[PDB]
Amino acid sequence: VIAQLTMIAMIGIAGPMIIFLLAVRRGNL
Amino acid sequence: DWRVLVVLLPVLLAAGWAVRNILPYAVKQV
Amino acid sequence: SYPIFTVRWVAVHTLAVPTIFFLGAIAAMQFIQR
Amino acid sequence: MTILFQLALAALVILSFVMVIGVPVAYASPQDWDRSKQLIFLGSGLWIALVLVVGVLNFFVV
Amino acid sequence: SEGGRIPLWIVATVAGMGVIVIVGLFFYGAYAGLGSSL
Amino acid sequence: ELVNVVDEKLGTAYGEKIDLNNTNIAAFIQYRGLYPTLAKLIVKNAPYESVEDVLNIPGLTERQKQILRENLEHFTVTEVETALVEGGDRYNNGLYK
Amino acid sequence: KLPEAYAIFDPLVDVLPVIPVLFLALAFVWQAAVGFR
Amino acid sequence: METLKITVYIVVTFFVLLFVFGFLSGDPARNPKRKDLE
Amino acid sequence: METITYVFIFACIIALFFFAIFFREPPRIT
Amino acid sequence: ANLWERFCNWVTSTDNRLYVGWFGVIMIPTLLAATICFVIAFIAAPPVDIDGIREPVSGSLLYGNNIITGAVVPSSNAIGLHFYPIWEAASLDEWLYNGGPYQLIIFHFLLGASCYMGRQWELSYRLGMRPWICVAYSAPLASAFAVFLIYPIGQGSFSDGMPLGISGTFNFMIVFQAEHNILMHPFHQLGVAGVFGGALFCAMHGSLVTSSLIRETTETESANYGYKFGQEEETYNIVAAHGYFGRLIFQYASFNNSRSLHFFLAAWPVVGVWFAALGISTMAFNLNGFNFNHSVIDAKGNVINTWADIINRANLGMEVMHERNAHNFPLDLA
Amino acid sequence: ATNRDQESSGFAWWAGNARLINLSGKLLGAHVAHAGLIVFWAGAMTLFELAHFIPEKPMYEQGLILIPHIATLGWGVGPGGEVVDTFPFFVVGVVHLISSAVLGFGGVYHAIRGPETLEEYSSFFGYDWKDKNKMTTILGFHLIVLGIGALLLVAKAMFFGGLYDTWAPGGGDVRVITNPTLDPRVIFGYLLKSPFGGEGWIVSVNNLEDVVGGHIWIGLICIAGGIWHILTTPFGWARRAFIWSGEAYLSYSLGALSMMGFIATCFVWFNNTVYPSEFYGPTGPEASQAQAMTFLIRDQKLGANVGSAQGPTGLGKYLMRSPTGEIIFGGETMRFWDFRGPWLEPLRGPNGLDLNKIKNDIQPWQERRAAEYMTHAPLGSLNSVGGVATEINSVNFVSPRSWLATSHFVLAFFFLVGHLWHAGRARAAAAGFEKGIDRESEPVLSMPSLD
Amino acid sequence: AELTPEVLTVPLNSEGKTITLTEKQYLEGKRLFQYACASCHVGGITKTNPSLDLRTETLALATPPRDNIEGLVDYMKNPTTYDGEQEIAEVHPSLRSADIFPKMRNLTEKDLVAIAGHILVEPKILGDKWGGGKVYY
Amino acid sequence: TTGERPFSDIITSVRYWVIHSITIPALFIAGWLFVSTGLAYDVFGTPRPDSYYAQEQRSIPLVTDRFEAKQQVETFLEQLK
């Protein structure tokens, strides 16, 4: 019941992570 | 009652904290 | 240039402070068992 | 054999995560598109490969 | 400190996720403990 | 002069015991051993001029007769009431829980 | 249930079906990042 | 009844045909601006 | 008399629809 | 021009006092039929065996009803969802006993109103308007479909469609509450927010525009004469209204954009009522309101009632009393 | 950043995707990525269902909607719909998820990396919305693809194990369809049935032969039509009837999808042939009927003569006549006499329910099925409390039929709304007043007064 | 009020021997009853035959007595009509008919005991509600 | 504007978050303990799951006298031993 929260943390961050990486490196957002 | 101090210790520690951090601007304003 | 402790500040906090405390309480309640 | 399956599946999941964050950031990146394109090709072939490997080893651990 | 340092889109995303988390907790509580009918 | 016949029957032995001639079959659940076998036989072979005639139902086992004898004190008989026995109401009287 | 071998991934499987929804939410994070222009 | 039925069937068919052919009769062009929509 | 009354009020209302629509004071632009 | 050309030209004419149009070609006869049948039935139709148990209910004025109690009564439960046109009955007397007038009226009406929506699109097009008034109208129309068509389909009988009458409408509501707990359904709740809110904003908007009417008249005449039809100037000061409202709450809670504002005025009640309609339409398939009956339990296991349980008692009263001679088996399964 | 703010594109962020109307490469991206979302949900949801699946519980007791779809196709189930091997479910899920990774890949590629427009790139893959020939060509392509799909169902039914047949003699079982109904009289006969009670239009299809034959027909019609639209261009009357633009086409497809959603709603609510009650639970009609059956059995066991038992209203308490005479179940379920199901038909004779068969031929499996279906009626609360609205908490149940019906009614409705929106907008834009009225050319000002 | 060991002490057999269930046993029992039984027996009534409920007094007057653990376990193995005269496994879920009532398949002896205990304890909590039906809701 | 600093400014400033990343969780924890310590029950007079009824009683402690209501509630509370 812990790994559900861990995985949804990794996935759930995976989304905003892309946006952040691109915004930092001034990518084509 | 001990539960009152246990419960209202975080509140007053937060109050003391922000008071400490905002004191100079507060004095400057007042 | 900007003040900190305005009427707006008071209003905002009379609402915001209790709200967070109450939310902490309700959170705790989610683990109460009969 | 079970160890191979478990390796292949763990690798599959990890590579998948890496690709999920990586391919869009790469596509939208101005710099270093050449090596990145290389890496996307690489990771793609390895992704396909890993899927086929988990697929095969499935019937030898189930 | 200066205003504008922390991007508003990050504040929004973080806040939003926090809301989803607390509400998610509350819906979890509908099935567990008090109020669960069990 | 106008009378509710069901209310009237409630003031007879019908309001006191299982009426072998009228009562709905579910009543036989009140006592050990009567439902469903004996209840079905009883309602089927109604009406009865007296309670002990219930013992004269053809085909009864000795066990069955013993159970009936054990429960005659809980039985009665009154005139068949059309209102209570039409519409198959002795098998289903529109009452559930 | 899943075949025994894959049991380790049970929590992951519990979370996957909601991932499409995340995409809709992502569209907004993205828009906020370019100021809803 | 049968006469009533046939009557109604004829009426309904008539009006439905009116509707369909009516909308087939260059409707995009029946507006106050750009009538060239073909 | 009740029925007559109900139908009469209704009928008046329909008549009123007729006049309010076809015998309205025409809107005019200035 | 030929005859059909002339005809199309008149039908679609922007000069007709009432616009006809191709949707109108279907609308006018179906609505006239529904209207005529409804008035005649409401006045003079005999009792109708709504629940198909030879227990005819009187709906018309001549058969003991007033405006409040009267109704055109839904077709017989024995008919179910069967198509029951006049020519399917052996006679008018049969047709009336079995509630044919109802099916004639609701089908003609649903068609007619659908065409009313279309017609709204059409005239908007002919006049060079934007097209979405008809979309606002889709909300009440969808509701009508919900209570007249969809719910009967879901429950398997037009006998459970809403009656064409005031008290009968109330019958529908009470029974609905008993069988679906509609009050505890978030879509009905969104519908209430839709109409309460629509009323609120109607009053709000009316009052704000009225408050900031520019002085154009004397005290001894209606302020309304200060506006002339077709004038190019806006007749109220929207900056004054916004200064007011913005100070009533706070600035950024208020609209300064009239387009945005009016869009809001359209969107809120329309959306709310869309959800009300969807509430009826999905409770049509017995997905019901939240059931928290016996949800709170103490340490021993004693049930602790909430207001939800009191609601449940009321619902029980409704349930056991409704259609008191129609159930033979213990579960009301439709 | 071409067309990616309001000033350049004309569209605000909330109408953002409208910026893709003439950016066919990026639009291709959006579409393929979305297809990836769909295939993703199929896979993921399937694996999820399987993980939560207890094979000895009925599917419909477990909130399953996809595994029932897989089982209806013959995979994983044996006689009576018993789950005999879950592996095909696993396969279907895994493969869908894996494929969703590919579709996602292509979608993201075309969406933010590949050519933004496809016309300069390829004259084959590029298109102009106004180009009726190309439009009908793409339409043709996809028609052929659909016809192929329908033919895949046909092939599964006839050559690869068959389908689950709830009507199979001796009980429900997977069966190979060898003699599909090919007669056009039957196939299109369905299409001309009234949608009203006791008729049910195409929703009334009640044997697999008709299903398979219908899909044969639909496959050939689709491939033929697809070829037809590749090879032709719209005729004159067609040209004069329609609005030819991206938004218009979108509106048309939205209308079609609305229609289909409503149709699916009725299908899952009434039909128990392609939605076997073994997997999806009993239909509403079915469960009501099943209650009638249940208490007829109980009371007849107690010695009741169910054929002559007069209920309180004067109608039979257990049995009565339909308006055309057939013997049917009594009480409220009189509305549901059009119901047909494998557990009830053995009691049916030429004149309807048969009293002799009812007295003498009711098997224990029939009693069982009736009790099961009676006690799993598609009634339940939004938080999944099974039963009537006044039932107390204890049973966690809402029928898959309710879930599917309601979901698709909502989706169909909002899609009808979408069609109105985009049809009206398409007309207004093609005619040139979608952005408002020209003050210097206000049409009504050039019209005569109404009065 | 609490779920005490006394509340959890119920008749094991007809001879007046009792057994005291654990709270885990009580919980397992409610769970298993919901899993295999509530579809017809929610609240202690019987939806497909309301004349027979699961109230302790009713079970007591059944033949053989079903107001104790042995009786209930046996019923779950070889169910009879109320008078004991007929065996009804063909139309009532049981281990004996776990082939046609598939949910009965994965039920262990331990499980049957838990279900039985639930049937016996619940009326001690809910009172007239148990077997009461909507009147007592 | 009305004088006050824009909210965007404030809630995207480093100092704001330095303060509130302390003050917000402190409050949250305080409410959490207000419940978890059980203090809430006793401040507001709310029954714990074991304090609605005495063990065998099944009658609601309904207040029935206006002016001696306090004594009544206190009696009802004593009745839980």
Ligand code: CLA
């Ligand atoms: C089904 C959901 C969906 C899809 C497929 C799209 C697709 C698109 N949108 Mg739309 N949009 C959507 C919903 C969607 N949108 C919603 C809900 C909104 C309201 C917030 C919008 C509002 C909107 C606006 C205002 C605009 C678009 C635009 C676009 C296009 C270009 C986006 C871009 O280049 O930004 C670049 C973004 C990035 C580079 C950040 C990363 C984005 C990628 C796709 C994330 C990939 C994540 C994924 C997990 C990776 C898996 C990799 C793996 C396979 C290896 C693209 C075709 C733009 C357009 O039309 O341009 C002409 C545009 O201006 N959208």
Ligand code: CLA
């Ligand atoms: C066709 C669509 C569909 C249908 C019929 C179902 C049906 C079901 N799902 Mg599934 N599912 C779906 C899509 C669907 N789902 C999607 C999109 C996801 C990803 C989020 C999932 C992920 C999922 C999980 C993880 C689980 C289920 C489960 C279930 C079962 C319990 C449902 C429940 O309690 O809902 C609760 C009801 C709601 C939350 C109400 C939703 C109301 C929506 C939000 C309103 C939308 C209105 C409209 C679209 C908005 C338009 C805006 C307007 C302005 C125009 C039920 C069989 C459960 C199960 O039992 O598995 C075995 C379960 O655990 N589903």
Ligand code: CLA
């Ligand atoms: C599904 C719709 C679709 C359409 C219309 C296109 C169209 C295009 N793609 Mg794209 N793309 C797609 C999906 C699509 N793609 C997918 C799913 C992926 C991930 C694999 C990609 C990844 C991709 C890349 C990396 C590139 C393209 C390129 C192109 C362009 C050149 C293609 C070509 O000439 O190949 C010729 C065609 C063949 C050699 C035959 C293909 C054989 C197929 C794969 C067999 C399977 C057929 C079967 C029907 C598939 C069923 C799938 C279904 C069940 C979901 C063309 C505009 C190129 C481009 O844009 O250049 C700038 C390019 O570099 N695509």
Ligand code: CLA
């Ligand atoms: C187009 C007509 C059509 C119809 C009526 C059906 C009906 C059915 N399909 Mg089939 N199928 C079709 C085409 C169709 N299918 C196609 C094109 C494919 C390939 C994608 C399939 C692949 C398929 C599979 C794999 C399965 C089915 C299954 C089924 C059954 C259950 C699913 C369902 O409820 O669909 C309801 C159908 C609809 C809602 C579509 C209605 C279409 C309307 C009548 C016409 C729309 C035309 C359009 C709006 C206008 C055209 C424009 C032109 C006139 C100018 C049901 C009998 C399942 C089954 O049979 O289990 C044994 C199943 O497993 N279908």
Ligand code: CLA
């Ligand atoms: C996605 C499916 C699809 C779509 C969108 C189209 C679209 C088109 N087709 Mg094509 N076609 C298709 C598949 C499709 N086709 C298939 C599968 C075949 C083989 C059967 C054909 C055979 C075909 C021929 C022979 C012709 C077309 C033509 C056309 C064009 C005009 C059609 C039109 O005005 O429809 C609107 C429909 C009508 C005007 C028909 C009468 C209108 C009444 C009111 C329809 C009532 C139906 C009713 C509501 C449905 C309820 C159920 C019913 C069965 C009882 C249009 C581009 C025409 C064209 O221009 O070719 C280039 C043309 O001559 N199609």
Ligand SMILES: CC1=C(/C=C/C(C)=C/C=C/C(C)=C/C=C/C=C(C)/C=C/C=C(C)/C=C/C2=C(C)CCCC2(C)C)C(C)(C)CCC1
């Ligand atoms: C299958 C799989 C996978 C995949 C994954 C994926 C595909 C993922 C994705 C993911 C994603 C895709 C994510 C996303 C997320 C998102 C989010 C999390 C968001 C949120 C949002 C929000 C919160 C919002 C907010 C806001 C804004 C921004 C503005 C306005 C306001 C508001 C508040 C609304 C992997 C690799 C793991 C491996 C295993 C299996």
Ligand SMILES: CC1=C(/C=C/C(C)=C/C=C/C(C)=C/C=C/C=C(C)/C=C/C=C(C)/C=C/C2=C(C)CCCC2(C)C)C(C)(C)CCC1
């Ligand atoms: C364009 C765009 C967009 C969208 C996008 C999208 C929508 C995408 C999609 C994508 C996708 C659609 C993706 C997918 C992916 C997937 C994956 C990545 C998967 C993987 C898988 C795996 C890894 C598996 C595994 C396994 C196995 C094999 C066995 C069993 C178990 C398990 C599950 C573990 C947006 C809105 C954002 C905005 C911008 C633009």
Ligand SMILES: CC1=C(/C=C/C(C)=C/C=C/C(C)=C/C=C/C=C(C)/C=C/C=C(C)/C=C/C2=C(C)CCCC2(C)C)C(C)(C)CCC1
């Ligand atoms: C598979 C199957 C089957 C079959 C199916 C089929 C064979 C179908 C067909 C279908 C069809 C065959 C359909 C059709 C449709 C059509 C439509 C839907 C139409 C539409 C139209 C429109 C929309 C038009 C409009 C208009 C007008 C009216 C006027 C002028 C203008 C316009 C053009 C706009 C069966 C049942 C046997 C069985 C099951 C399986």
Ligand SMILES: CCCCCCCCCCCCO[C@@H]1O[C@H](CO)[C@@H](O[C@H]2O[C@H](CO)[C@@H](O)[C@H](O)[C@H]2O)[C@H](O)[C@H]1O
């Ligand atoms: C019940 C379903 C019926 C389905 C019928 C399917 C028919 C398919 C072929 C349709 C042929 C359309 O034929 C259509 O009618 C007449 C024929 O003189 C034409 O006539 C129209 O011309 C112009 C067009 O600007 C109009 O202003 C004018 O009012 C009208 O006379 C239409 O322009 C033509 O497109």
Ligand SMILES: CCCCCCCS[C@@H]1O[C@H](CO)[C@@H](O)[C@H](O)[C@H]1O
């Ligand atoms: C498009 C993917 C196709 C995957 C392969 C499907 C094999 S289908 C396979 O065929 C057998 C008869 O030939 C059946 O007996 C069996 O039940 C069935 O699953």
Ligand code: OEX
């Ligand atoms: O019909 Mn009118 O109401 Ca719908 O539930 Mn069943 O049925 Mn009757 O009872 Mn309840």
Ligand SMILES: [Ca+2]
């Ligand atoms: Ca405890």
Ligand SMILES: [Ca+2]
């Ligand atoms: Ca072509």
Ligand SMILES: [Cl-]
């Ligand atoms: Cl009523």
Ligand SMILES: [Cl-]
């Ligand atoms: Cl009934």
Ligand SMILES: [Cl-]
């Ligand atoms: Cl009783």
